[PDB]
Ligand binder design. Structure first.
Ligand SMILES: Nc1nc(O)c2nc(CNc3ccc(C(=O)O)cc3)cnc2n1
Ligand SMILES: Nc1nc(O)c2nc(CNc3ccc(C(=O)O)cc3)cnc2n1
Lengths: 265, 238
């Protein structure tokens, strides 16, 4: 319905687009490029920017606290001084949660739902809203007896593990984790039954943008997955997903306009 | 009700969303246009003065193996194009032109009705009324297709009121064809020229198909077909 952070509120009356700002290889300072990209997504109509410096697509190895901080935390500083936008950090490290909060992050986006050591206490201590992600968890054929029950149970579990650590239930966001331990069938069943997760009375955030769930249906490169990614965005928005995490902000934002105009007539 | 449609000895499976490419030596450039749409993923090609000898239906009939539809109102243009080898008749003015009602009955190919000026009530009763005529003077019910006529004597508000309530029209147990591609209902929201109206047209199309609309009439075939897989995959998981 709304979000609260660092004095600012965000409107979940209508679907909100989050621009992915990855900071791994930028390809002219690397910060400069990040800032230009951020800028371009704001213009386009994102009202949140997700800053990630973790090569979290399967394989490709891992990252250490010190390396993530150096890559992530400057851009957090830079954007915060520069623009008025919800800034989100996708990280699982207590240190990156800590230092990014000081830097002016508005939202903690954790694909590991604070499972990492002290992450939970670091998160709680910032008083900032947290997004939790269903993951099935290392190379394994995903399987569920019943996918939605499993997602419902996972969230139930982690909402409580958060509410006991001191994070108000209304700091919490839920993301069912498209493409995380989910085959193609699973992803579309989850898309299909998305509206069901509205029962926790928390906002939903979803990320389908240029994922293999579009690639494997349309058999195209990531940069040619714009339309399908958008079509996913439209299907989720019609089921009342509050926040859409995307690469292609301009297209998606236009798309949400049609959705909102349709949800108003 | 799982659906299919048969015409001129050919079958069109309507249990999933179908994309119909709009169409408008210059005859070579049109024939080249069709091919692009065919390879994009069209399964119907909608071909749009007193005399316009359209041998393009003839060209396409002969050239390809794909549904051919024509949006036309006049009593002559319907029959001659069947001679050519068409599969479907698309009329905006729902056969109001003298003769056409009967002219389209002697050719034995599918027909498409289109609404033209409580908004939904008005449309429904209008439709119900007009379906009565077609059974009354020649053509059996399972040969009719229903177009709501987006942007035809309709306010922006209203068009979105329509799109929102589109699922309701499945109570006549006839297939729907919608046309919203690069229309004013999109342009006035997004404040952009037609070429840049792709994404908004595709967004309408998804919203239409999520509501079981079986045929979508588009300028932007590749994008729309792409979008209908995402839609079909979603509806198949259900
Ligand atoms: N909240 C949130 N939600 C996500 O969905 C997400 N995804 C990634 C990147 N993850 C993936 C996963 C799978 C795939 C594929 O199968 O292609 C691609 C990218 C990073 N942060 C994320 N954060
Ligand atoms: N089956 C079918 N269904 C249509 O909806 C359609 N529309 C047109 C073109 N009609 C319009 C009407 C309004 C507008 C605008 O307001 O922009 C644009 C085009 C031509 N053939 C059509 N055929």
């Amino acid at each position: 319905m709304h979000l609260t952070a660092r004095g600012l509120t965000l409107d979940l009356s209508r679907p909100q687009v989050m621009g992915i700002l990855n900071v791994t290889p930028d390809s002219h300072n690397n910060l400069d490029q990040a800032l230009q990209h951020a800028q371009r997504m704001l213009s386009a109509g994102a009202t949140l920017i997700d800053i990630g410096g973790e090569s979290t697509r399967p394989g490709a190895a891992e990252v250490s606290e010190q390396e993530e901080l150096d890559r992530v935390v400057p851009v957090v500083e830079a954007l915060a001084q520069r623009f008025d936008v919800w800034l989100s950090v996708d990280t699982s490290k207590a240190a990156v949660i800590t230092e990014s909060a000081h830097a002016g992050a508005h939202l903690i986006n954790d694909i590991r739902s604070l499972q990492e050591p002290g992450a939970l206490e670091a998160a709680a201590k910032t008083g900032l809203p947290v997004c939790l992600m269903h993951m099935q968890g290392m190379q394994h054929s995903p399987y569920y007896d019943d996918l939605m029950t499993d997602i419902n149970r996972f969230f139930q579990h982690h909402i409580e593990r958060c509410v006991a650590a001191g994070i108000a239930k209304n700091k919490l966001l839920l993301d069912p984790g498209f493409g995380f331990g989910k085959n193609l069938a699973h992803n579309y069943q989850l898309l299909a039954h998305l509206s069901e997760l509205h029962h926790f009375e928390l906002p939903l955030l979803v990320g389908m943008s240029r994922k293999s769930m579009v690639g494997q249906l349309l058999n195209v490169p990531p940069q040619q997955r714009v339309i399908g990614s958008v079509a996913c965005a439209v299907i989720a928005a019609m089921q009342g997903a509050q926040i859409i995490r995307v690469h292609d902000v301009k297209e998606t934002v236009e798309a949400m306009c049609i959705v909102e105009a349709t949800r108003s007539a």
